[PDB]
């Protein structure tokens, strides 16, 4: 379930609903991805409280 | 039965997953004595015999259709088949 | 005017507080012209006609103007200026149902609701003095707006419950000329009506409960019949939603006093709700899901209606639903409400209570044994740990002549399986028995008592060596009982020997002091075979 793969297009494959590794669905059923990312940069340019 | 029937419209393609909770959601259905429990179990067994005549669920139904009935056969059941001072205490020890 | 033309307002103010000060000093008849037959119904309805078209039904092409604190007061003043020449409040009440279109950011809706939701505190305010001519028209010749009327009543309801000051008796005519009016509006519920009227009359029948004293509704004395038919058909809707069956049921205190069949229909529609709404395990709601917050918040309110009513009416129902799941999120308020329904009320209460749980789990209802132990384990156990006193006493001596009847000898069928029915109601007999052993004093259990008497035939001269002396015999035997040839129920019976033995502690500690009595119970084992 839990996944960390990386990949240079990678952004593209979650918006298609596909993780960076070419698996997109088990035993064809489809999987419902969230996406976590962790960083910094993106807080230090908020205007509000966040 | 009807909280649980619309997982296996296109979400989930497998319904050997979902199968389980609407056996399950008979089973304490069974066990209460209480009328309205008997009366809504029919209900969901109803939605449960639903599914092959639109799915061809045949390959699989039968083989549960007589496992509920058989359960019964362990229970009784016979209603739930209509619808188809020292001294003394010395002495002793 | 807009926001510039303070002076107009400020006169116009000062004119009306004069002729207020006129009609409260009784010479508003002399001094504006009363001489005709209409006269001052002619100035009252040119000052209402006034205040009432002066908001917008002239500039229906580009917007409503904006009411400011200046004008909020002003009309405020001008209704009551009106309303002081006479008794229009038929006029009145005929202009507040107008379903016209108000062309307006958009909210399109009838005029006299904004009429209305602009001055709300003075309708209500002057409609308290002449009662019954208003109410019974806004009754009879609105059933067809079916929302206007419930508003006009509820601001009614809402201004007699802020007239409470000395002045209750109002609020007792309302209840009486409402309850004589019920059968007025038999079209608000039903199987058709749209959720509006449905919330409406929900929000009548949660006011009036409160602003109709017990007096004059206590049991089938303020018409009954159809109050009573009237919330049935309420709860049986399953077109609602259950946030507001929450407060439906929230307001079951007041209907849990009945005694005839009327109490039986109300289980009936309580069953029907909550097996068509609660879920079998309550876990497939996490949490932040708004249906398991509808869930706790419903079944808090619950145990709340529960906890101010201490009614033996639901709590069957509460615990039914609290056992038939293994373990429930809400345990700790379900316990925290039983000791307090336990604690509040008078003995009798807590009696009633202990013997409703006990023909609950008592009988022989095809249940499971698990749940029949969950059932008396969780809520039996409780409030007897929690229960006040000269209560004990009375359950003992009801109670343990058929215990005891029953823990003899009574070991049979043990063929079809089913003996863990058996040891589950044996098992629960030994827990009653040693939560009733470890609060009861020495000499209350162990002395010239009246229950060790109700216990025997009659009166016993002894001091009580026959029910304690078959006690101890029976968890002797229990939790002695050798398991070499017995392989069918093993883990029910090891609990029922751990009930037996829990139970031989509490009644072997409660009255002996010897340690004698203490190695020659709970320590003499006796190795003979497989003792
Ligand atoms: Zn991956």
Same mark, same amino acid.
């Given at each position: 379930?839990?996944?960390?793969?990386?990949?240079?297009?990678?952004?593209?494959?979650?918006?298609?609903?596909?993780? *960076?590794?070419?698996?997109?669905?088990r035993?064809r059923? *489809?999987?419902?991805?969230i996406?976590?990312?962790?960083?910094?940069? #993106?807080?230090?340019?908020?205007?509000?409280?966040? | 039965? %009807?909280?649980?029937?619309?997982?296996?419209?296109?979400?989930?393609?497998?319904?050997?997953?979902? &199968?389980?909770?609407?056996?399950?959601?008979?089973?304490?259905?069974?066990?209460?004595?209480?009328?309205?429990?008997?009366?809504?179990?029919?209900?969901?067994?109803?939605?449960?015999?639903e599914?092959?005549?639109?799915?061809?669920?045949?390959?699989?139904?039968?083989?549960?259709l007589?496992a509920?009935?058989?359960?019964?056969?362990?229970?009784?059941?016979?209603?739930?088949?209509?619808?188809?001072?020292v001294?003394?205490?010395?002495?002793?020890? | 005017?807009?926001?510039?033309?303070?002076?107009?307002?400020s006169?116009?103010?000062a004119?009306?507080?004069?002729?207020?000060?006129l009609?409260?000093?009784?010479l508003?008849?002399?001094?504006?012209?009363?001489?005709?037959?209409?006269?001052?119904?002619?100035?009252?309805?040119?000052?209402?006609?006034?205040?009432?078209?002066?908001?917008?039904?002239?500039?229906?092409?580009?917007?409503?103007?904006?009411?400011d604190?200046?004008?909020?007061?002003?009309?405020?003043?001008?209704?009551?200026?009106?309303?002081?020449?006479?008794?229009?409040?038929?006029?009145?009440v005929?202009?507040?149902?107008?379903?016209?279109?108000?062309?307006?950011?958009?909210?399109?809706?009838?005029?006299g609701?904004?009429?209305?939701?602009?001055?709300?505190?003075?309708?209500?305010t002057?409609?308290?003095?002449?009662l019954?001519?208003?109410?019974?028209?806004?009754?009879?010749?609105?059933?067809?707006?079916? =929302?206007?009327?419930?508003?006009?009543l509820?601001?009614?309801?809402?201004?007699?419950?802020?007239?409470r000051?000395?002045?209750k008796?109002?609020?007792?005519?309302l209840?009486?000329?409402?309850?004589?009016?019920?059968?007025?509006?038999?079209? #608000? #519920?039903?199987?058709? &009506?749209?959720? %509006?009227?449905?919330?409406?009359?929900?929000?009548?029948?949660? =006011?009036?409960?409160?602003?109709?004293?017990?007096?004059?509704?206590?049991?089938?004395?303020?018409?009954?019949?159809e109050?009573?038919?009237?919330?049935?058909?309420?709860?049986?809707?399953?077109?609602?939603?259950?946030?507001?069956?929450?407060?439906?049921?929230?307001?079951?205190? $007041? $209907?849990?006093?009945?005694?005839?069949?009327?109490?039986?229909?109300?289980?009936?529609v309580?069953?029907?709700?909550?097996?068509?709404?609660?879920?079998?395990?309550?876990?497939?709601?996490? *949490?932040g899901?708004?249906?398991?917050?509808?869930?706790v918040?419903?079944?808090?309110? $619950?145990?709340?209606?529960?906890?101010?009513?201490?009614?033996?009416?639901?709590?069957?129902?509460?615990?039914?639903v609290?056992?038939?799941?293994?373990?429930?999120?809400?345990?700790?308020?379900?316990?925290?409400?039983?000791?307090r329904?336990?604690?509040?009320?008078?003995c009798?209460?807590?009696?009633?209570?202990?013997?409703?749980?006990? %023909?609950?789990?008592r009988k022989?209802?095809?249940?499971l044994?698990?749940t029949?132990?969950?059932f008396?384990?969780?809520?039996?156990?409780?409030?007897? #740990?929690?229960?006040?006193?000269?209560?004990?006493?009375?359950?003992?001596?009801?109670?343990?002549? /058929?215990?005891?009847?029953?823990?003899? &000898?009574?070991?049979?069928?043990?063929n079809?399986?089913? $003996?863990?029915?058996?040891?589950?109601?044996?098992?629960?007999?030994?827990?009653?028995?040693?939560?009733?052993?470890?609060?009861?004093?020495?000499? /209350?259990?162990?002395?010239?008592?009246?229950?060790?008497?109700?216990?025997?035939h009659?009166?016993?001269?002894?001091?009580?060596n026959?029910?304690?002396?078959?006690?101890? =015999?029976?968890?002797?035997?229990?939790?002695?009982?050798?398991?070499?040839?017995?392989?069918?129920?093993?883990?029910?019976?090891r609990?029922?020997?751990?009930?037996?033995?829990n139970?031989?502690?509490?009644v072997?500690?409660?009255v002996?002091?010897?340690?004698?009595?203490?190695?020659?119970?709970?320590?003499?084992?006796?190795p %003979?075979?497989?003792l």
């Amino acid at each position: 379930q839990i996944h960390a793969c990386r990949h240079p297009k990678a952004e593209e494959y979650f918006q298609w609903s596909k993780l *960076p590794c070419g698996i997109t669905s088990r035993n064809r059923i *489809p999987l419902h991805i969230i996406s976590i990312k962790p960083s910094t940069m #993106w807080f230090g340019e908020r205007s509000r409280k966040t | 039965a %009807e909280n649980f029937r619309v997982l296996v419209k296109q979400k989930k393609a497998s319904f050997e997953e979902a &199968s389980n909770q609407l056996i399950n959601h008979i089973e304490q259905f069974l066990d209460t004595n209480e009328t309205p429990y008997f009366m809504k179990s029919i209900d969901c067994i109803r939605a449960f015999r639903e599914e092959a005549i639109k799915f061809s669920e045949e390959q699989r139904f039968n083989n549960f259709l007589k496992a509920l009935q058989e359960k019964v056969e362990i229970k009784q059941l016979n209603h739930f088949w209509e619808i188809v001072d020292v001294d003394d205490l010395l002495d002793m020890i | 005017y807009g926001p510039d033309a303070q002076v107009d307002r400020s006169r116009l103010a000062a004119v009306v507080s004069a002729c207020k000060q006129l009609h409260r000093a009784g010479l508003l008849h002399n001094i504006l012209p009363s001489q005709s037959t209409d006269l001052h119904h002619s100035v009252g309805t040119e000052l209402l006609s006034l205040v009432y078209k002066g908001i917008a039904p002239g500039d229906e092409r580009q917007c409503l103007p904006s009411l400011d604190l200046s004008c909020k007061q002003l009309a405020s003043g001008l209704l009551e200026l009106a309303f002081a020449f006479g008794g229009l409040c038929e006029r009145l009440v005929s202009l507040l149902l107008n379903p016209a279109v108000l062309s307006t950011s958009v909210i399109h809706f009838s005029h006299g609701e904004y009429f209305y939701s602009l001055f709300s505190e003075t309708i209500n305010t002057e409609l308290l003095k002449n009662l019954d001519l208003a109410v019974l028209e806004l009754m009879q010749s609105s059933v067809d707006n079916t =929302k206007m009327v419930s508003a006009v009543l509820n601001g009614m309801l809402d201004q007699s419950f802020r007239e409470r000051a000395n002045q209750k008796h109002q609020g007792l005519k309302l209840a009486t000329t409402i309850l004589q009016h019920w059968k007025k509006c038999d079209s #608000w #519920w039903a199987k058709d &009506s749209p959720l %509006e009227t449905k919330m409406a009359v929900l929000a009548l029948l949660a =006011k009036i409960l409160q602003i109709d004293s017990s007096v004059s509704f206590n049991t089938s004395h303020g018409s009954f019949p159809e109050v009573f038919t009237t919330y049935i058909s309420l709860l049986a809707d399953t077109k609602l939603d259950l946030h507001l069956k929450g407060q439906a049921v929230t307001l079951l205190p $007041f $209907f849990t006093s009945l005694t005839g069949g009327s109490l039986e229909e109300l289980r009936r529609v309580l069953e029907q709700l909550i097996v068509a709404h609660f879920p079998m395990q309550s876990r497939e709601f996490p *949490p932040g899901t708004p249906r398991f917050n509808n869930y706790v918040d419903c079944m808090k309110k $619950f145990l709340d209606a529960l906890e101010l009513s201490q009614s033996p009416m639901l709590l069957e129902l509460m615990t039914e639903v609290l056992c038939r799941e293994q373990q429930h999120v809400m345990e700790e308020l379900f316990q925290s409400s039983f000791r307090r329904i336990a604690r509040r009320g008078s003995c009798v209460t807590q009696v009633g209570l202990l013997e409703s749980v006990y %023909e609950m789990f008592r009988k022989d209802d095809p249940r499971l044994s698990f749940t029949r132990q969950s059932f008396v384990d969780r809520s039996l156990l409780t409030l007897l #740990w929690h229960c006040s006193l000269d209560a004990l006493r009375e359950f003992f001596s009801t109670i343990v002549v /058929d215990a005891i009847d029953v823990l003899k &000898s009574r070991f049979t069928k043990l063929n079809e399986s089913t $003996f863990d029915t058996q040891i589950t109601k044996k098992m629960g007999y030994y827990k009653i028995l040693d939560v009733m052993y470890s609060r009861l004093p020495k000499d /209350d259990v162990h002395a010239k008592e009246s229950k060790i008497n109700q216990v025997f035939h009659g009166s016993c001269i002894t001091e009580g060596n026959e029910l304690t002396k078959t006690l101890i =015999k029976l968890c002797y035997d229990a939790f002695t009982e050798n398991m070499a040839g017995e392989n069918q129920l093993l883990e029910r019976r090891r609990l029922y020997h751990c009930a037996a033995y829990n139970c031989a502690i509490s009644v072997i500690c409660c009255v002996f002091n010897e340690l004698k009595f203490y190695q020659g119970f709970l320590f003499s084992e006796k190795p %003979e075979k497989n003792l």
